[PDB]
Amino acid sequence: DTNQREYYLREQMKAIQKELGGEDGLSDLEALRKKIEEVGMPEAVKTKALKELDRLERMQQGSPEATVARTYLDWLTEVPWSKADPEVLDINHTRQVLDEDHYGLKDVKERILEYLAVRQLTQGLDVRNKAPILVLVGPPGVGKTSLGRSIARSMNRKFHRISLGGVRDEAEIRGHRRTYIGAMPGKLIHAMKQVGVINPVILLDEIDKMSSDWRGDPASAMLEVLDPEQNNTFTDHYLDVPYDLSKVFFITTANTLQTIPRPLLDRMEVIEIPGYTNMEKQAIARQY
Amino acid sequence: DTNQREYYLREQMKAIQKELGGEDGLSDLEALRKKIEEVGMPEAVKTKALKELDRLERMQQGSPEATVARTYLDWLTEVPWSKADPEVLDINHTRQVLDEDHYGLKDVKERILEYLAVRQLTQGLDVRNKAPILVLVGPPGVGKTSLGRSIARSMNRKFHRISLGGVRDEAEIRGHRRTYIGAMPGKLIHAMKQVGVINPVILLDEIDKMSSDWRG
Amino acid sequence: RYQLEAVKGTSDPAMLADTIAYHATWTVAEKQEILELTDLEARLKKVLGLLSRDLERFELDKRVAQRVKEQMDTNQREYYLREQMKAIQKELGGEDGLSDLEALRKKIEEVGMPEAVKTKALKELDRLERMQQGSPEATVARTY
Amino acid sequence: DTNQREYYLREQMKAIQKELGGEDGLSDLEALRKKIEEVGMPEAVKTKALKELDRLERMQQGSPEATVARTY
Amino acid sequence: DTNQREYYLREQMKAIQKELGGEDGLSDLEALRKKIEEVGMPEAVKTKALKELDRLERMQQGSPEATVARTY
Amino acid sequence: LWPKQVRESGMEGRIEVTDAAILRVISEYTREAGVRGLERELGKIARKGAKFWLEGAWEGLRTIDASDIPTY
Ligand SMILES: Nc1ncnc2c1ncn2[C@@H]1O[C@H](COP(=O)(O)OP(=O)(O)O)[C@@H](O)[C@H]1O
Ligand SMILES: Nc1ncnc2c1ncn2[C@@H]1O[C@H](COP(=O)(O)OP(=O)(O)O)[C@@H](O)[C@H]1O
């Protein structure tokens, strides 16, 4: 008798589940599907996502395994593909914005300004666009971290910062096999989830303290993520599809040049800040 | 007459599969027959395929076993099965193809040329059993990773790169154990899924820095 | 419905608001509003919102029951038909399975191999043999 | 209208489903998120919490993903 | 139908068991609450124990997290 | 590397370098076993040339000598 009622209750949830499917699912997931078919990863890349989409959809409605792949599909749909911020603008307007946020920093300002010169010279061409990586080395007192917002306001870009360094979990950088209980794509990908552009501003705060040895090496994982050309086809442990990380503009923060593994050290665009002068100190004290 | 009984029972089970097993059973009669026709299935791999083929006909009503079984079957459908690429006949042309991708590297170029010359002179199947294995050691600045793509393009063998940059638990590089969600984000076989050729050129991020866990 | 079909002869908006508000098909918090509202015109208006949402629930709950009852029959009928189709093939598979496997074992039992291991498998095999549906243990017993 | 209609349907279905099994489950979560509406966090994480609770408001009872999803 | 009949017999045996074994299991949880009562733990620890037994009762058994939760 | 960075900078046919300046470039700016750090410098050359071109465009092509390295 109890089994009868339980079964009566089940169809009750089903009727409710079917009603919900008519809302969150069905046409709603059809619209998202066609939308991703419009601005999602290429079809040859989307193939894995389609693999999971077919099984999770084929799985009985409400199946945890369906949700196990449903999170993967939703992550692929939410993460931007081939969508970017508006391209190169006038350098004269942005140089004042970069100058007013921070006094001095001539080398970093020159780097930021000249990054737009090539963007202007490659207007309408058919060449691969690769945003250079950035590393800032210097004492912790130097305002390297504020560059994450300063540069973003310089090019009106969207910015997010991930507190890397002093970490021992490769699976954090490259997520992990979606098969394991739950699921968490690598931090980078988590940072770029909310930024709806393929060229965000990402700030690797103090990656110098990166700790390896025991456990999957977070740093060794960032090798595939920070490869200058292989980031065009990037397959972390969670997102099996080759991610197009080429357009992403990277900024990394460091305090010295003697605690970094060699493959990381000889792959960055080195920018050094030896420290402000005392005249610069009194000027910045007076102004800001 | 008994053989026709067997055929009638087989067509009955195929009909039930086609009518009910959405994307499993009608996909069976439509494409799995041609699947063996295009990629092929070892009899040992096929006998068990047929043994489990009638077991996952529980779609519409719903069966995670049917889906995970179907994920396994779909993985079997596309992985190359004794289907080789058109073997290279002009190693001299490959020489120029490899010379137009890199400069120098006279050691690895000659190594690959020897490996192809032996394969072209394999009289009797006694060398194909031992797949040649190359490990590349040196500073990271040297172009080792793109060498995989260069060699594969010169071989006319489709290329796939596998992320060995960081691998901790076991089965993170090899195919994960079956029976579960049935979702595998890349693997050694995954490269085989990418390349429909039984003999591709596959490169890894590195070997010195890989497995590092307690469970596996 | 007895309190509605007795005072239908009066067209007082306040009286109709009282009739549609006394039948409290909601929480007592809403009943405080009608209890203390110096706006008979808004009385029926706010009651309209409650009864309209309640009417949505009225039809919605009826539809849920209709969906559950129709699904009940479909699930039952599907269960009977689908189970038979599978149990038929699974019955054949079971015979073609351990039943054929154990035969092969018997073929090599010509050496008088101890059948105690078989009898243990038979315990599993009698139970799963009777169960012509599911029984994943049958597969593990098959490999055993 | 649509938002309130789907919230009310979710609340009633959660109520019945958790009365039949584990009352202090997704009904507890829906009450808690109704509170977090009144004590609203930054908009960046408000939508994240809503999406997170919505996806786990449809799975079965005692799901292995739900074991950590409820605690998060 | 024979499978249904043996299911009938097995749930008969389950009835016999849950009469003695199952009620002992319920008596085990009832005695667990009696333990959390007798010790006289302060109010915060009371609420923590109540929430913990609430999260345990919602989920099923035979999971790695369940062992740690049970022991703790 | 030079054709690739020139194509990536879009200013094809506008900058050229002699065979003597490159010797100084490697012998004085980058000392690594590989050439991964060399592509970053060779693209910096084009990135700084583009800064001059954007403000003022010249005619024809520009040849870089060993004495013109510090400017770019
Ligand atoms: N030129 C400058 N203009 C404005 N603020 C500055 C300047 N130089 C340093 N600062 C300030 O110094 C501090 C440095 O802190 P932070 O950027 O977090 O350092 P780090 O990047 O080393 O962690 C910030 O408050 C920053 O605004
Ligand atoms: N002799 C060479 N010929 C061609 N490219 C070279 C040569 N030496 C180095 N390279 C370049 O080195 C780079 C290596 O990058 P990649 O293979 O991703 O990483 P890694 O340097 O760690 O192997 C490629 O851009 C490649 O073209």
Residue numbers in the entry:
A (entry chain F): 218 to 505
B (entry chain E): 218 to 433
C (entry chain D): 146 to 289
D (entry chain A), E (entry chain B): 218 to 289
F (entry chain E): 506 to 577
Task: Reproduce passages from the article.
The Lon protease is a AAA+ protein found in prokaryotes, archaea, and eukaryotic organelles. Lon is involved in cellular protein homeostasis by degrading damaged or misfolded abnormal proteins, which prevents these unwanted protein species from forming toxic aggregates. Lon is known to form a homohexamer; each protomer is composed of multiple domains, including an N-terminal substrate-binding globular domain (NGD), a long-helix domain (LH), a three-helix bundle (3H), a AAA+ ATPase module, and a protease domain. We show here, using cryo-electron microscopy (cryo-EM), that the activation process of the Lon AAA+ protease may involve a pentameric assembly and a substrate-dependent incorporation of the sixth protomer to form the substrate-pore-loop contacts seen in the translocating state.
To test this hypothesis, we performed single-particle cryo-EM reconstruction of the proteolytically deficient mutant MtaLon-S678A incubated with ADP and the model substrate α-casein. Indeed, 3D reconstruction of the data revealed a substrate-bound hexameric form, which adopts a close-ring structure with the substrate-pore-loop contacts in a right-handed spiral-staircase-like arrangement. Previously, similar close-ring hexameric structures of Lon were only reported with the presence of substrate and ATP analogs. Here, our structural analysis shows that in the substrate-bound state, the sixth protomer Ac6* binds to the pentameric assembly and bridges Ob1 and Ob5 together to form a close-ring hexamer, in which the four substrate-engaged protomers are Ac4-Ob5-Ac6*-Ob1. In this structure, Ac4, Ob5, and Ac6* engage the substrate polypeptide by the pore-loop I (Tyr397) and II (Trp431) residues, but the lowermost Ob1 contacts the substrate by pore-loop I only. The three protomers Ac4, Ob5, and Ac6* are tightly packed. By contrast, the protomers Ob1, Ac2, and Ob3 are only loosely contacted by their AAA+ domains; and their pore loops II are disordered. All of the substrate-binding loops in the proteolytic active sites adopt an active conformation, albeit not as ordered as in the inhibitor- or substrate-bound states with ATPγS. In the close-ring hexameric state, the pore-loop-I Y397 residues of these protomers and Ac6* mediate substrate contacts; together they are aligned on the trajectory. However, when the substrate is present, binding of the substrate to the exposed pore loops of pentamer may induce binding of pore loops of the sixth protomer to the engaged substrate polypeptide presented by pentamer and promote rapid formation of the closed-ring hexamer with stabilized substrate interaction.
